Design a binder for this molecule. Sequence first.
Ligand SMILES: CSC[C@H]1O[C@@H](n2cnc3c(N)ncnc32)[C@H](O)[C@@H]1O
Lengths: 625, 310
Amino acid sequence: RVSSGRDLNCVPEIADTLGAVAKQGFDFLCMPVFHPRFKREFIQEPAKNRPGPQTRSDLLLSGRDWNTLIVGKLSPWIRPDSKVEKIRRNSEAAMLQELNFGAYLGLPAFLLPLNQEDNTNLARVLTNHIHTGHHSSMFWMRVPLVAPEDLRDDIIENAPTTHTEEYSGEEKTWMWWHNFRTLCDYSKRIAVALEIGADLPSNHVIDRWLGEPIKAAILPTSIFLTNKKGFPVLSKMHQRLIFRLLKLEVQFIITGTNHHSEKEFCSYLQYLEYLSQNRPPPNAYELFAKGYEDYLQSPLQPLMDNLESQTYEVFEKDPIKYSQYQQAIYKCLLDRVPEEEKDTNVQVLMVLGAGRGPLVNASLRAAKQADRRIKLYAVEKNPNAVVTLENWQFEEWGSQVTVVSSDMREWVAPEKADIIVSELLGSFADNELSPECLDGAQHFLKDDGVSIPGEYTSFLAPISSSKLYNEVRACREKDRDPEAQFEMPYVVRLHNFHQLSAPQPCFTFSHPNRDPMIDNNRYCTLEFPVEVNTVLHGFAGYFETVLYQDITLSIRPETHSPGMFSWFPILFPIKQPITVREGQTICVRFWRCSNSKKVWYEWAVTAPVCSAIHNPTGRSYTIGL
Amino acid sequence: LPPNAPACMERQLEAARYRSDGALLLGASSLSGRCWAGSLWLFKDPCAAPNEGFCSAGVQTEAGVADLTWVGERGILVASDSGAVELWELDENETLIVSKFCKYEHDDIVSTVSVLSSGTQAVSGSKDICIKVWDLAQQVVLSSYRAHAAQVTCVAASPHKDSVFLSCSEDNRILLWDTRCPKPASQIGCSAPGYLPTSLAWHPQQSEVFVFGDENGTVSLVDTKSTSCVLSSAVHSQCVTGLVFSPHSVPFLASLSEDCSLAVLDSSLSELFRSQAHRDFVRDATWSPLNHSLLTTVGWDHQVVHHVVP
Ligand SMILES: CSC[C@H]1O[C@@H](n2cnc3c(N)ncnc32)[C@H](O)[C@@H]1O
């Protein structure tokens, strides 16, 4: 269903209040840990020597309750950036005190406001609390989509509201967030409590928050409409945002008094649940992409490494891609054996990297479908997978299939091939070294032979995700370069991100490769027009391949093959995030580089600013030949 | 101790308001410890206060009392931490205090209340940034104004004009309101943006002059007409929480700060008197109707102090 809490700034009895909100179906309570009005003096006598207690006792709840049900709140008088020095000092002292109490209590989260532009000293104090013990507890920064000054009623005769359009200005609240998090050096403990108003801003303003670490959405009772039966409800545009936010799995917080007085506060929560269960449904693929959202993975290197049984099992788990392969071979067979020559003509079909035989089985289904005759070679360098193959061939395929336990670049074949078939492609196409492997094998392909696939193309797109930037940054390891995390690609179901530009083709390969001298090295320059203010954090990679003629496979979103959504895209990080102003072009440069020993990518951004070249001479990342 | 009157007054004394007859209205909050609530007390003998046993009447409020005001002689209008504005009514015998109405219209703590010149209307101000106008008899909100862009600190009704009230906020705005204008609010302030405005008091006789205190302890006298920042004194080492005019023909002005001090100032803003009596925050002042030279201060030190002013 939905994870939801109640926001209160009045708790007479913490016991009854918590009990009440439980009966109303709230998972947790946001409340002050000190009385919001109880302003404290730390430096000046006599109020400094105010007898205590300074707040209510930890003993009033279980450690478990404090740990799970309670989100603390900074008292609203606390103004660390106050221009008034005595207020600044008392607010520094009080903020430390209240944060130290939430740590004392074991609170899972604590709410702090970003309610103006300058929160420098507030960030400096929070950073201090974070750098005082390693603790897990989250800090939810309460920021509004729309600054209060731009929300205010136009009811001041001599202070009219500026009704003029303001692209940058309407985005001021994100800049408040950006500056705070940047000062606190992207602490994983600091996330966004996004506060929504009755008036949503422009879609550009909402888009600003796409890649940001949103843990909580705050819905005032104010923003809720009333149906005929007098139930609380939301505008379709509000409802669209909820459906957007459910995808990011945020916790919803209900703030304000009951305005639908006939009905209980169950009413507001009832509505959210109603939206949850009745949400535009996803797909099996989104169920396939189940728990992998923004989960960073090492790209598989099935050449340099021998894949495990369950790796092959997952490759086999999506039948559709093999049905595509079956179809490409079927078509190629009919184009090569006239119906007159069906029984005289038996084609030599070689599966190059046969794994546990899915392409072998697809090749066989294709031949019986075409009613045409094939001899099969199953070539596989992974001797563990040869075990699976040789049991299959003994038990089922028989002597039609000759299993070969060899690297296709070393193998001396007894005869030349009509058709070579392979699945040597990664999420960035050539990133498993299909080029080098098939190049080594082509000397044993007939002069009129077909490679399936005949072609593949990598695509790139610039993306924004402060979330994934932090994920990568967090992948530092001992005994290597402290920044090697950023100079290697990751396979990942990119989820909390913004794609800043349409994907552009990067590198393309063709098989057979007729070039008299063959260079699989590449240098490509891409220009991505960007129509929004944003921060570049890296580049999403995808691929398309032509198996045969019109039969293709793609993970490129615009051309995505059906059923192949368990096959995730790739991410090329950059070390330093890059600010991009609307109307600017992002220019990225990519190299595919090689030795006898290793193939690697190097990459740089040249616009709107220059990055360092990432992964120079494969220092951080190579692919084994 | 009376019937319906609690054994123990909450420690944090928020409000002190003398009625015409000289009876004392007390508001108190529990701002620490287990239970965070408040209380309303009537002391027909003001010198007994704060002692609960020697009280004419007392009641417990669900939540703390941020602000208070007399509504005529038997009415008490309350700013609650709960976001409710509540109307409490005195008994015929005035031996107990009964809730007339409690309306939860504010989304956050109700910080400030004032009764307008009619006595049938009040203005509320809240940390929720809204200012509301109340039909006291029908117990509803006539108007709700989001003029400000931060928490509303003070709202003070005009002495004699039922459409006019001041407001101040941490948006650094002093707003002059007139509900007769389709754009009711008007920003009033000295040439330089200065320290946040904290406290407000209309001149009792001069319907177009008011005074405001700031978070830096400066007290300022303002003429709507001249719209010039006429006079300012550095009266306090900290925030000016409250400003109260004497009942005198030429009024004296009581100044109360978080510096835990009270000062009394002439119309020229010069300082006649100073009391260090309180050892915590000074929350309110009411001059005795009976003896105009007598002034009662209340503080979070739970002290009810009676001052004789020279
Ligand atoms: C089915 S995933 C790709 C398969 O091709 C195999 N493979 C990759 N490169 C080569 C090569 N050069 N020679 C033989 N098999 C290969 C891998 O072991 C893997 O099972």
